[PDB]
Write a protein that binds this ligand. Structure first.
Ligand SMILES: OC[C@H]1O[C@@H](O[C@H]2[C@H](O)[C@@H](O)[C@H](O)O[C@@H]2CO)[C@H](O)[C@@H](O)[C@H]1O
Ligand SMILES: OC[C@H]1O[C@@H](O[C@H]2[C@H](O)[C@@H](O)[C@H](O)O[C@@H]2CO)[C@H](O)[C@@H](O)[C@H]1O
Lengths: 160, 160
């Protein structure tokens, strides 16, 4: 009955602490003011968007790899190996209908994460780790990111 | 479990039909790529954002008046008079923290409409009329709109 909107500007390489955590029912949307589908190779990730728990766990890791022409979704506890990674083939195909900008949305359905690029749902991710999101990061491979140097993030919390 | 994201480009003077209706629990966000808090007088509204029913009723009317330095929230059935209008004083005060752009968010709480400008909740509107929103309009007074000529709209439906 009293939802909230929080806006963040995330510079590449940075991690921001959410003024309000993202839990079941809440939403996170990343806005990119540019799209470079022919930027270069990632080491191996050109661009990575992360949702992190209060103790460093990678609730959700989203990685775009041009050289491999794929998108990877994984998770992992702090100082622990990477877990079972789901992948979606064809990067450009997902950004069809972009036009110099893109938005990635993540719905926290509680027991899963729905990832949408623009208007297309790309995957229904099954949570390998549970918990509320308290911080988000935008990591890039030097000079080869498919997104703008600064990505805007909007969270809609306190829905359910 | 299968929420949806729809993007719309709304030119001043137009109405768009939502590919997906907005009902209780859903969200609508308007994005303006400009802010003119010194554009001029509205006749009387400099800019109006409307949420309309499949019947033409104005579920929610949001109007910004610079000459009257106020924001009006009303509703009305088709070919009927305007109802009880709620008002918020001080236009600029609501956009504090903007900086060349703004976003207005409307949460459909079922029996109310929470309106947020950027991160500030401006009013918890009590629905004078109920129903699902099926179309949206952006009206303005020639040359005196406080928003860009084109406003982007993003709806998040199928939440509840
Ligand atoms: O799980 C995402 C994670 O992948 C790492 O690379 C993996 C690679 O994708 C996989 O095919 C191989 O078997 O193991 C590599 C190392 O775990 C990236 O290095 C890391 O940054 C994440 O993107
Ligand atoms: O209710 C919104 C509606 O207001 C109309 O103007 C009002 C005016 O603000 C009020 O002071 C007067 O008593 O009644 C008018 C309605 O006849 C606008 O003309 C209309 O466009 C809406 O903005």
């Amino acid at each position: 009955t009293t939802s909230a909107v929080n806006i963040y500007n995330i510079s590449a390489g940075a991690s921001v602490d959410l003024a309000a955590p993202v839990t079941t029912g809440d939403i996170v949307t990343f806005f990119s003011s540019a799209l470079n589908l022919s930027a270069g190779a990632g080491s191996p990730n050109n661009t990575a968007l992360n949702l992190l728990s209060e103790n460093g766990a990678y609730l959700l890791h989203i990685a775009f790899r041009l050289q491999e022409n794929v998108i990877v979704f994984n998770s992992r506890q702090p100082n622990a190996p990477w877990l079972v990674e789901q992948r979606v083939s064809n990067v450009a195909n997902q950004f069809i209908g972009s036009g110099g900008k893109a938005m990635v949305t993540v719905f926290d359905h509680g027991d899963k994460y729905q990832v949408v690029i623009n208007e297309k749902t790309v995957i229904q991710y099954t949570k390998q780790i549970s918990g509320t999101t308290s911080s988000l990061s935008y990591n890039s491979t030097e000079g080869t990111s498919i997104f703008s140097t600064v990505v805007e993030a909007v969270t809609y919390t306190g829905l359910a």
